[PDB]
Amino acid sequence: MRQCAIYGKGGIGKSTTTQNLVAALAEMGKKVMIVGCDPKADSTRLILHSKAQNTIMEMAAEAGTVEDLELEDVLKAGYGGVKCVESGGPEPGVGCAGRGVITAINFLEEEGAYEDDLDFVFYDVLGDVVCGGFAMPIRENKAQEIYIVCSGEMMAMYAANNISKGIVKYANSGSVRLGGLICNSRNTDREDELIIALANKLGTQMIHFVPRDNVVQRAEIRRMTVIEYDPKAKQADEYRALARKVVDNKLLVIPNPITMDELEELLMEFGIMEVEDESIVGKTA
Amino acid sequence: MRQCAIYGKGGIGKSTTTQNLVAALAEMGKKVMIVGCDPKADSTRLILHSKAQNTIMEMAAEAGTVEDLELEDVLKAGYGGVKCVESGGPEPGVGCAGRGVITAINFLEEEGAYEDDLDFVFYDVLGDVVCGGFAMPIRENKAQEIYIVCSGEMMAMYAANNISKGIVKYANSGSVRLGGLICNSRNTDREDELIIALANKLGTQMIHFVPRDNVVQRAEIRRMTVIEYDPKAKQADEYRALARKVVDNKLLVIPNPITMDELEELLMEFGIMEVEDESIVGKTAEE
Ligand code: SF4
């Protein structure tokens, strides 16, 4: 069983890419489980055709304690037999993402959910502020092959750099490694070139460039993946290509994070960021 | 001294509005301090015309402990005499954002940064995932008046609701209260009506609607607020109006958070989100 995680910031389609990748793996005959660890996204909605899946945190509070929770109420099967679980985001004002994911993983391990025919587990993790809590899957050596979803924009690339810093922090134990960057296109010129250049500086690869295509939203509105909604679409073949490359990937590395100066240099080289006129700084009109 | 915090999610102009509001208060004769508590934004760059202000976390790490730091190296003055500090985000992979923010605030107190002549302190806090960490300024009673920057978009309004739930969590034990919503316009139709409706459901008010105007960008490129770059511009009057309403505000409430169904209902009612056709859910193209 390969223990994987998809990390990335919010608002760039990370969870839609994760679920479409997972659907492509199931189509290939792989047994997969998704464990949602992103308080800002529905990590399983497209596999289950659901509005919202009951979370481990919510159900544990409904049954009093996680000790009296039944696996059947938290683990659901959807398209292609993919098994789906949601951890539950932190209780507002009180919770910590690190505590929630420890609780979910310990529960699934005690109930034998990882023992199956399982070929892959994917943790879908919010990777923006890479604090100790959201890095808990790394610290606990559960997210062993990490793929970072990003886009050719400053905040998404900054997040990729901070996720890489988190991987570096734990390099002296366990075996957590970076497997590559996935570029979720935003229809920006030279975006593919930019993420390839970032991957090169980080010491990894851009494993796939995911195009923007209206069929993604046509499937999302029906609460499904493209693989299920229209397996003949061009975009379905894009997710199949990504899935094949993930299955076959042996290029797992400890990355080399960059400085903010180096990041700004990349954004300028590829036309995203304009040069700063230091001569007008502080000058009124 | 009034202890305020601005909470809201990233990517919607929160720190730009905070600094322009603070600059308007300084122009009004108020002595203000900004304490930056957002890992993802720069809360002081437009007050200092700076590319980046050295943070307490980074300087403490170089010096060894926060006990080795001098206030003169972390607290800098900029436009209108506004004093600026940056807490610094968590060390990636290990740190907690809240523990760093509380370490920073305690250092400022012990070194007398809250001078008896200060009119306002504003904490600029990331309010998206409102975990225990980013609620630590609320739990530790460091900010009494919370203002939420939002916009007429699902994720920003979800963040506003989460911030409100964090406030409720500590209301029976402390004095923290919600003072209002500030709408950062995104040129979306009926956006002001949407935030007026949300504020009413939560029990608060829309304290101001901040329009979008190219003059904000023209000042930003020079690392400046609009108040300093062009105090005659119309947008400069919006920040002054916002500053006046904050000074005069007396509505400080325990909010009433809404459910996600009620939030989607608001978004569908005001044209942001379409009605969902249940009949096509789960139906393949072949069907
Ligand atoms: S470690 Fe991160 S998720 Fe946990 S309370 Fe601190 S900031 Fe929040």
From TrEMBL, chain B:
One Pfam family matching this protein: Fer4_NifH
Note on how the cofactor is bound: Binds 1 [4Fe-4S] cluster per dimer.
UniProt key word Chaperone: no
List of residues that carry ADP-ribosylarginine: R99
Matches recorded under SUPFAM superfamilies: P-loop containing nucleoside triphosphate hydrolases
Binding site for [4Fe-4S] cluster: C96, C131
Catalytic activity: N2 + 8 reduced [2Fe-2S]-[ferredoxin] + 16 ATP + 16 H2O = H2 + 8 oxidized [2Fe-2S]-[ferredoxin] + 2 NH4(+) + 16 ADP + 16 phosphate + 6 H(+)
Coiled-coil segments: none
GO molecular function: 4 iron, 4 sulfur cluster binding; ATP binding; metal ion binding; nitrogenase activity
Keyword ATP-binding set for record: yes
Cofactor(s), names only, from the UniProt record: [4Fe-4S] cluster
Enzyme class at the top of the EC tree: oxidoreductase
EC number: 1.18.6.1
Residues annotated to bind ATP: G8, K9, G10, G11, I12, G13, K14, S15
InterPro entries per UniProt: NifH/chlL_CS, NifH/frxC, Nitrogenase_Fe_NifH, P-loop_NTPase
Keyword annotations: 4Fe-4S, ADP-ribosylation, ATP-binding, Iron, Iron-sulfur, Metal-binding, Nitrogen fixation, Nucleotide-binding, Oxidoreductase
Superkingdom classification of source: Bacteria
Function: The key enzymatic reactions in nitrogen fixation are catalyzed by the nitrogenase complex, which has 2 components: the iron protein (component 2) and a component 1 which is either a molybdenum-iron protein, a vanadium-iron, or an iron-iron protein.
Family: Belongs to the NifH/BchL/ChlL family.
Quaternary assembly: Homodimer.
Name under which the protein is recorded: Nitrogenase iron protein
Organism lineage: Bacteria, Pseudomonadati, Pseudomonadota, Gammaproteobacteria, Pseudomonadales
Gene it is expressed from: nifH
